């Protein structure tokens, strides 16, 4: 389990608003929140809180840089035959969609730019390497979203899927469509398709929205194996049913170290249970002073998750 935090820079709208930048990342693993506060007498003072993470990324850091530290180290895990998960967690507008899906203040744009794409790129390169080539693996991808306890296939026009659990308690999402990909270009097509289809409200003036949980997965399969050779699930979480899933998620990840159900944790459950499984959590933070309450909430959540480490 690795937990990181990434601060996004203040946007033009916030800047114009003259929002104050409350966060500083003086070191590679140190994040500081300069919380503004007022005493009862309304004296102004700053309570600077410090948080440490495996990796803390500044506003300057690009998606490639973030990807290098978080997801990239997980790819090998799938080739190893494990199950890896990477979660983007944070408040609305914190940058989760931007990081996973691609660069866009709308959270929707260039697929190539995001972690799903970058991860895919590495998957093809590694498969090609000598240690792996013997494996004769096929790469498959799927993209679905979870909304109000319901699973929808982004690859198959929001088709509602049913999720069942055996006595064995292994979960399966029936009807989920897996698409064969043999090129990064292929994966980019599927990402574009899924992202367009993603849930939301009316066309907002700007930005996307995270009413749902987005999960794009990369699966490796020889002919089954452990029900497939390896699987990487990249999840674009909804802004911090949602609460229950987040609570559920925390316990599952912490359970990962040692070894109040939700749909997300149910679908993901096989990814937590196995011995050979790794996860990375990236906490997104919006630097604005107005968002200070949200950020502390995000950071504290993050602390507990890493605690399991």
């Amino acid at each position: 389990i690795t937990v990181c935090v990434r601060k996004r820079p203040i946007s033009r709208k916030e800047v114009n608003r003259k929002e104050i930048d409350v966060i500083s990342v003086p070191r590679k693993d140190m994040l500081i929140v300069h919380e503004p506060r007022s005493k009862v007498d309304l004296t102004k003072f700053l309570e600077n809180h410090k948080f440490r993470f495996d990796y803390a990324f500044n506003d300057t850091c690009d998606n490639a840089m973030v990807y290098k530290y978080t997801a990239k180290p997980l790819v090998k895990t799938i080739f190893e035959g494990g199950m890896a998960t990477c979660f983007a967690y944070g408040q609305t507008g914190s940058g989760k969609t931007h990081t996973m899906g691609g660069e866009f203040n709308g959270k929707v744009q260039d697929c190539k730019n995001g972690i799903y794409a970058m991860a895919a790129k590495d998957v093809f390169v590694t498969l090609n390497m000598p240690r792996y080539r013997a494996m004769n693996l096929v790469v498959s991808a799927s993209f679905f979203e979870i909304y109000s306890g319901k699973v929808f296939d982004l690859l198959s026009d929001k088709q509602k899927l049913r999720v069942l659990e055996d006595g064995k308690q292994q979960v399966q999402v029936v009807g989920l469509t897996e698409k064969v990909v043999d090129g990064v270009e292929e994966v980019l097509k599927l990402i574009q398709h899924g992202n367009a289809a993603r849930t939301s409200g009316q066309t907002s003036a700007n930005s996307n929205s995270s009413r749902s949980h987005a999960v794009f997965q990369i699966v490796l399969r020889p002919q089954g194996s452990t029900k497939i050779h390896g699987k990487f699930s990249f999840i674009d979480l909804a802004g911090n049913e949602i609460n229950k899933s987040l609570l559920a998620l925390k316990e599952c990840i912490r359970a990962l170290g040692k070894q109040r159900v939700s749909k997300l944790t149910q679908v993901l459950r096989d990814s937590f249970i196995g011995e050979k499984s790794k996860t990375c959590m990236i906490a997104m933070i919006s630097p604005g002073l107005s968002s200070c309450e949200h950020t502390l909430n995000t950071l504290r959540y993050a602390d507990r998750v890493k605690e399991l480490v």
């Binding site: 069942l164 659990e165 006595g167």
Partner: peptide
């Protein structure tokens, strides 16, 4: 898997 589901 339906029966499995329910029982569980």
């Amino acid at each position: 898997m339906e029966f499995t589901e329910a029982e569980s």
